[PDB]
Amino acid sequence: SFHRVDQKEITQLSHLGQGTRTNVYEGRLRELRVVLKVLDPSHHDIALAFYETASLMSQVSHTHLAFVHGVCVRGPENIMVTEYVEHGPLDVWLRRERGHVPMAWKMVVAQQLASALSYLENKNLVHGNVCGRNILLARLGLAEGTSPFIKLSDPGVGLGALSREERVERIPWLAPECLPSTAMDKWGFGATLLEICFDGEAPLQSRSPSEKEHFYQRQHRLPEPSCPQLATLTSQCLTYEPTQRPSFRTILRDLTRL
Numbered sequence: 001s002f003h004r005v006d007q008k009e010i011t012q013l014s015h016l017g018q019g020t021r022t023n024v025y026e027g028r029l030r031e032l033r034v035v036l037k038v039l040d041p042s043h044h045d046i047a048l049a050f051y052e053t054a055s056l057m058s059q060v061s062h063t064h065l066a067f068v069h070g071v072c073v074r075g076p077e078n079i080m081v082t083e084y085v086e087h088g089p090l091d092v093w094l095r096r097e098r099g100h101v102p103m104a105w106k107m108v109v110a111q112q113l114a115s116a117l118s119y120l121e122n123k124n125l126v127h128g129n130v131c132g133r134n135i136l137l138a139r140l141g142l143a144e145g146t147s148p149f150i151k152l153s154d155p156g157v158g159l160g161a162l163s164r165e166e167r168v169e170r171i172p173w174l175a176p177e178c179l180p181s182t183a184m185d186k187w188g189f190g191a192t193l194l195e196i197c198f199d200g201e202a203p204l205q206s207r208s209p210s211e212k213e214h215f216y217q218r219q220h221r222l223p224e225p226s227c228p229q230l231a232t233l234t235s236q237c238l239t240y241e242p243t244q245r246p247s248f249r250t251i252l253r254d255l256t257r258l
């Protein structure tokens, strides 16, 4: 279930970048500034995983979740119309501001992200693509006495429809059980906290596919974060056994208790 957008209602503007089986553009709806996620020419199983994401995102509402306006489906074209968030992806921003992002700023982002994921967990919904690229900055929190404001974006094509090579490319955000899950987002959240702590440089992100697969096969563990208040929590989320990961209710409480 999602809103159908007619092709006449959307205008495509400049290219923002590439996603998994997609090209992202700034656009106009009706006029409202939006983002257009244009799926590549695809088989039906890929387009169905794109529809499942649009349906998931159309049935949720949370202050830290990005809005989905609908989907344009006509012949070979599939375009998801999503919320344009003022300052774009968190990973890109963190890399530009490297060395100048305070610890307190990172803690706020962590709590907002846990609140969005606690909301999804309570509705028994899995995101499957938690990473810095999918976290959007609505407010920067740069001025004295202000705080950042993030929105978790849609997960794009569902993990279940991707190739093994594409899953390997998602290491370290990919939960290890997904390599060959109501707990996969806890691992994705933990790897995103490391990515945030390291100013947008996630561990392993540069390693070759075979090096990434060996790390998981041997159950080597990711580094401790540079934020000392997040070390216990990241270690608990980044456990190979899925049943040992804490719930987002616990994660969100553990963050408020710091």
Ligand SMILES: CNc1nc2[nH]c(-c3cccc(CNC(=O)COC)n3)cc2c2c1ncn2C
Binding pocket: 015, 016, 017, 018, 019, 024, 035, 082, 083, 084, 085, 086, 087, 088, 089, 092, 136, 153
């Ligand atoms: C400003 N608002 C938004 N910007 C976005 N950029 C991307 C995006 C996606 C893939 C690769 C890149 C990297 N490209 C650059 O660094 C060059 O910059 C143009 N960027 C998605 C996205 C977005 C926004 N609001 C909602 N969403 C989903």
